[PDB]
Amino acid sequence: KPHISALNAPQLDQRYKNEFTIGAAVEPYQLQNEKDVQMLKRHFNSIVAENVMKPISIQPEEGKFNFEQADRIVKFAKANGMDIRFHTLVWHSQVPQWFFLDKEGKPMVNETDPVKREQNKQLLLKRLETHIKTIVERYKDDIKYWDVVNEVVGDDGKLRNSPWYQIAGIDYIKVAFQAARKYGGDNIKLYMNDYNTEVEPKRTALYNLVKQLKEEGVPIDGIGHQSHIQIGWPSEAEIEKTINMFAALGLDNQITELDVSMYGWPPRAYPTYDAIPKQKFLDQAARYDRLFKLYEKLSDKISNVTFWGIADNHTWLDSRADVYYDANGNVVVDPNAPYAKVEKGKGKDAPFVFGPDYKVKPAYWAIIDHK
Ligand SMILES: [Cl-]
Ligand SMILES: [Cl-]
Ligand SMILES: [Zn+2]
Ligand SMILES: [Zn+2]
Ligand SMILES: [Zn+2]
Ligand SMILES: [Zn+2]
Ligand SMILES: [Zn+2]
Ligand SMILES: [Zn+2]
Ligand SMILES: [Zn+2]
Numbered sequence: 001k002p003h004i005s006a007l008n009a010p011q012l013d014q015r016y017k018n019e020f021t022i023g024a025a026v027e028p029y030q031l032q033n034e035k036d037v038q039m040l041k042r043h044f045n046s047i048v049a050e051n052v053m054k055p056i057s058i059q060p061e062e063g064k065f066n067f068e069q070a071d072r073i074v075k076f077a078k079a080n081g082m083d084i085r086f087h088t089l090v091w092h093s094q095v096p097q098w099f100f101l102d103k104e105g106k107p108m109v110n111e112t113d114p115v116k117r118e119q120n121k122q123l124l125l126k127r128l129e130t131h132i133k134t135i136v137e138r139y140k141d142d143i144k145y146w147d148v149v150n151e152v153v154g155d156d157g158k159l160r161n162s163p164w165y166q167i168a169g170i171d172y173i174k175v176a177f178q179a180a181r182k183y184g185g186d187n188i189k190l191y192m193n194d195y196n197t198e199v200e201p202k203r204t205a206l207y208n209l210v211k212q213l214k215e216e217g218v219p220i221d222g223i224g225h226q227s228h229i230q231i232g233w234p235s236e237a238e239i240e241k242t243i244n245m246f247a248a249l250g251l252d253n254q255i256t257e258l259d260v261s262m263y264g265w266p267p268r269a270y271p272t273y274d275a276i277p278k279q280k281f282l283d284q285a286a287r288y289d290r291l292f293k294l295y296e297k298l299s300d301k302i303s304n305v306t307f308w309g310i311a312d313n314h315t316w317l318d319s320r321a322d323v324y325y326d327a328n329g330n331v332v333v334d335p336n337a338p339y340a341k342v343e344k345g346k347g348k349d350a351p352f353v354f355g356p357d358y359k360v361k362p363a364y365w366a367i368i369d370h371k
Helices: 012-016 028-032 034-043 068-079 114-139 163-168 171-184 202-215 236-248 278-297 316-320 362-368
Strands: 021-026 046-049 083-087 145-150 189-194 222-225 252-260 302-307 323-325 341-343
Touching: 012 021, 012 362, 021 028, 021 034, 021 083, 028 034, 028 068, 046 068, 046 302, 068 083, 083 114, 083 252, 083 302, 114 163, 114 171, 145 171, 163 171, 171 189, 171 202, 189 202, 189 252, 202 236, 222 236, 236 252, 236 278, 252 278, 278 302, 278 362
Parallel strands: 021 046, 021 302, 046 083, 083 145, 145 189, 189 222, 222 252, 252 302
Antiparallel strands: 323 341
16 A cells, blocks of 8 residues: 555545544644645544643633633634544643642642641632633633543552642542533533553542542543553553443543554654664554554444644654664664663654655555455
8 A cells, every 4th residue: 555645645534434533633833834734634523732722831820821822723623624622621740830839839738737738729729710710711612522630540540649639639620520511511521531541550540530520420521541552552452441441431432642652661762763664664554453443343432533643743752752872872672672871852753644754654554444
């Protein structure tokens, strides 16, 4: 199957249009790029902001809201008939730090007086409610799908002990969902998004958490499975088990940040795209073939599959693509092999079905067909 321009190729969203939407994560500058715009128009019918809707992008100082960049993505989506996902109302990553300072400008996490800790909790929950209120009041008629909370369960199966949790306890999760519903109404759909949703003990902890919130009347409509995965892990069998169990609780499932890395964890990357062997792309294609056959099998439980990017010339996985060198200066990609130095984040991953020259990869043909 030829390495043809993806602008010449059968439309990916149309292949899946009765099964689920097909989305991409974007940065506003990509909307000024001819090739990226043509890619979005041709292949995608859902969009998400890679970064300009995160809390520090939207309210970096209290009372200073920057919707300019987010508005550019919303405008493009509407003009092209695309669904929008909001990434994300609450996350421990890069919080604007003002959220967690007390009235005296000290870190709330250090407060030891119980009465004052309770005061800090209420202050923080109020700041949280105002952040969500302002964003949802602006976009409730434009954005259908919301990552209300992100990564709130730890890899150890305990709630993540971020300042959110330290200062306010489980109530910051409840307040985030209740505020989203209060200001956006019944028609926006509210998700808890996380990575490694297939992996125990995280999986069961996530399951028990959303079960509990629902039994208490907290409005949660779905789970977002980031799906930052590898060629071999996690198995399709375990992805299937995961999606089924959340569906059994009455939740929608979205695949929200899909990328299929060429590497293991921690990655030992090639320094450049050209150095990645051809066989890796065939292995990746087989993986995508199996993955999307599975997503189709479960399409009554999945409303959306979003890739965390458009084509391989731009992927956040490059930030993880550490290049290992031996004593002689040769690149080392075997995880158990000797090495002398590492260049963190300087290598190249290749996670999508579209290559860096916007031509289709073997993985594209593997998911555009009906086999
Ligand atoms: Cl990135
Ligand atoms: Cl190429
Ligand atoms: Zn389309
Ligand atoms: Zn090159
Ligand atoms: Zn190249
Ligand atoms: Zn579906
Ligand atoms: Zn990016
Ligand atoms: Zn090429
Ligand atoms: Zn296939």
